[PDB]
Curated annotation (Swiss-Prot):
It comes from Homo sapiens (Human). It comes from the Eukaryota. The chain holds residues 53 to 73 of 212 of the full protein. Disulfide bonds join C1-C15, C3-C11. The lineage of its organism: Eukaryota, Metazoa, Chordata, Craniata, Vertebrata. This is Endothelin-1.
């Protein structure tokens, strides 16, 4: 879990945020 900005969208799914492909 570590993205540039936690508010991003797909970069946010990488931190375990229910990725919705």
């Amino acid at each position: 879990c570590s993205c540039s900005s936690l508010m991003d969208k797909e970069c946010v799914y990488f931190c375990h945020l229910d990725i919705i492909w």
